[PDB]
């Protein structure tokens, strides 16, 4: 069975997530309305900007994160933001229509919508595939949340100074998840492996997203549609 | 009577204005919706950002502007943007309710609304007074447009290199307006003077706006609500 500290960590993450993930999606009405050159950029820019703020809120609650140097926290957020965001979005992803449903039909996104935000199938194909394979793992809230904490605490990111203290925090988390799957998840003898593999898929997606983003960020007619926070987090001006 | 070149200038400005000033205000639905700490900042930031793009469109059509150095064009836009914007807004200002009406009730702004965007009466009092006195001059479209071209072509702005070529372009404009008032505007024996005085009021407003803006721009929780274009035009990173 799980230890108290192991369980306290799970309770902390699940609560940090609930506190940073709004199931009513009542904030999407405050974004620049979606329009279906790059007509979806304004809306999706606000979505991502809003999601970054949520990921930051979450990160600050991951046990051990608050004690790192501001520099490492930055290095970790900047390098994993988009992957965490892709992980968070799976909650609203549907295996039927292969889309994201966030309240109303206005906020129902298809692969076509991201295309109108400057992205190509070069990225979207692997993205939907990742969403589908992830959705199929039918993760418990506790595993989904651990995966996001595991992801955010990867020491193998550029700019990370103390990759020993972070290597540790992630190890601690990785075993919590490993223990949880073995104790609380029936038919999950080979789930952990599949999950770690999902983290590897994220890297590829991250690489591809950054490429296409860089392309977009160098065109001022498009960069001007971005928000300050997005430009700072996806920027290279580190 | 007016000369052909004098009239061609008037026709060019009136057409540049019509091409950059949308009377249907059908673009306000694309802004982050208004919300009545600094709840109006998002919406009013998008309004101003959109207005800057219109002022730039207009400027590029002012005869003589396109031939200046990119540097002077920048120096002129950055220093006069807010004044031109205050001048443009008068078109939707009403002497009855003392507000700005841009289509629907959602887009009806009161002094209270700007307060929710980080501004104080220190600025808003003089602002409404300027709007009222301006509205009372009952300018013809030709005079209102000349005033905006006159304003934008003020050589006495920081960063202006060739204030001789610009001093000239503005002189040319100032006499066009002076001639128009004398020939086409009955009961306007003392209008020109009142107009030039209105340009002086704008300077005070500009000074005050920049002060309060600087205050806001140094607070990242607020600066992040701004748009790239606003930050660049009201920024000091010249």
């Amino acid at each position: 069975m799980l230890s108290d500290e192991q369980m306290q960590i799970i309770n902390s993450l699940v609560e940090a997530h609930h506190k940073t993930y709004d199931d009513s999606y009542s904030d999407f009405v405050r974004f620049r309305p979606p329009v279906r050159r790059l007509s979806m950029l304004p809306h999706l820019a606000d979505l991502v900007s809003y999601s970054i703020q949520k990921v930051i809120g979450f990160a600050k609650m991951i046990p051990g994160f608050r004690d790192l140097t501001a520099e490492d926290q930055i290095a970790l957020l900047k390098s994993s933001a988009i992957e965490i965001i892709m992980l968070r979005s799976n909650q609203s992803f549907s295996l039927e229509d292969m889309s994201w449903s966030c309240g109303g039909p206005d906020f129902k996104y298809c692969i076509n919508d991201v295309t109108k935000a400057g992205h190509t199938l070069e990225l979207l194909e692997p993205l939907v595939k990742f969403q589908v394979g992830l959705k199929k793992l039918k993760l418990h809230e506790e595993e989904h949340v651990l995966l996001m904490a595991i992801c955010l605490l990867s020491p193998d990111r550029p700019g990370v100074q103390d990759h020993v203290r972070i290597e540790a925090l992630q190890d601690r988390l990785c075993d919590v998840l490993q223990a949880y799957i073995r104790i609380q998840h029936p038919g999950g003898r080979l789930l952990y492996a599949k999950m770690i593999q999902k983290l590897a898929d994220l890297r590829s997606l991250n690489e591809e997203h950054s490429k296409q983003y860089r392309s977009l960020s160098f065109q001022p007619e498009h960069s001007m549609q971005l928000t300050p926070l997005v430009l700072e987090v996806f920027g290279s001006e580190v | 009577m007016l000369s052909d070149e004098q009239m061609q200038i008037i026709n060019s400005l009136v057409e540049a204005h019509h091409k950059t000033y949308d009377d249907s205000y059908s673009d306000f639905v694309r802004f982050r919706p208004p919300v009545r700490r600094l709840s109006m900042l998002p919406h009013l930031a998008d309004l101003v950002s959109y207005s800057i793009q219109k002022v730039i469109g207009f400027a590029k059509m002012i005869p003589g502007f396109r031939d200046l150095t990119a540097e002077d064009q920048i120096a002129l836009l950055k220093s006069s943007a807010i004044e031109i914007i205050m001048l443009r807004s008068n078109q939707s200002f009403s002497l009855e309710d003392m507000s700005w009406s841009c289509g629907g009730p959602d887009f009806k702004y009161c002094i209270n609304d700007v307060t929710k965007a980080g501004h104080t009466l220190e600025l808003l009092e003089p602002l409404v007074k300027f709007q009222v006195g301006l509205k009372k001059l009952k300018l013809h479209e030709e005079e209102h447009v000349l005033l905006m071209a006159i304003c934008l072509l003020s050589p006495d702005r920081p960063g202006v290199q060739d204030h001789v070529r610009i001093e000239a372009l503005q002189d040319r404009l100032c006499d066009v307006l002076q001639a128009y008032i004398r020939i086409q505007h009955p009961g306007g024996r003392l209008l020109y003077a009142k107009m030039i005085q209105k340009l002086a009021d704008l300077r005070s407003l500009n000074e005050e706006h920049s002060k309060q803006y600087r205050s806001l721009s140094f607070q990242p929780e607020h600066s992040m609500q701004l748009t790239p274009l606003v930050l660049e035009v009201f920024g000091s990173e010249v």
Binding site: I56, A70, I74, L229, E232 | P220, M224
Partner: peptide, 10 residues
């Protein structure tokens, strides 16, 4: 500069 990120991380 990352000034926005620093403020949010406080």
């Amino acid at each position: 500069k990352h000034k926005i990120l620093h403020r949010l991380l406080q």
